[PDB]
Design an enzyme around this catalytic site. Structure first.
Site: not given
Ligand SMILES: [K+]
Ligand SMILES: [K+]
Ligand SMILES: [K+]
Length: 149
Positions: A49, A95, A136
């Site tokens: 997405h 991604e 992250h």
RNA sequence: CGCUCCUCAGUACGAGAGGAACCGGAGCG
């Protein structure tokens, strides 16, 4: 190639907050994005997405934002995203989760959702031009950052 | 009516990086 990603994980094989150093094969990451559908998250997992990268659907950049210093053009070229993402003219960053063992993500199983991990392969739309491998900093949530290599 | 689960739906709606509800189904009060 191979990207080094740093991430804080609560090594369940311990519990504590550990500072792992994950290594990703660029080759394998790309393989990932290829076996992955070319849609804007209308799958069970929601991947792949759109990765706004600080931008909005116009190409204008959101307040207090700073795109990822990707390098190669396209990747750093303000995107153009339209609703379904499938704009007959659109071009943007997608991604998808990528893992050290570079296995392909079970993009369609929500309930139970295969854990996407901390890293993702970013590639262009609709040409799937590898851009980089971000992840992250803490866990598998929060603000994305481009890893080294 | 309240709560759990399915579903709705990874939809609608978002872009601080996510994400509902109504209808319906199973159950408890
Ligand atoms: K979407
Ligand atoms: K519900
Ligand atoms: K209901």
């Amino acid at each position: 190639a191979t990207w080094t990603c740093i991430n804080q994980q609560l090594n369940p094989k311990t519990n504590k907050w550990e500072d792992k150093r994950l290594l990703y094969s660029q080759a394998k990451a790309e393989s990932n994005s290829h076996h992955a559908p070319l849609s804007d998250g209308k799958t069970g997992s929601s991947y792949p997405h759109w990765f706004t990268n600080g931008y909005d659907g116009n190409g204008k950049l959101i307040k207090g934002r700073t795109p990822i210093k990707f390098g190669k053009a396209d990747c750093d070229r303000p995107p153009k995203h339209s609703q379904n993402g499938m704009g007959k003219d659109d071009h943007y960053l997608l991604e998808f989760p990528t893992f050290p063992d570079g296995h392909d993500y079970k993009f369609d199983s929500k309930k139970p959702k295969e854990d996407p991990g901390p890293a993702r392969v970013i590639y262009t739309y609709p040409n799937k031009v590898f851009c980089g491998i971000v992840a992250h900093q803490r866990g598998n949530q929060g603000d994305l950052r481009l890893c080294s290599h």
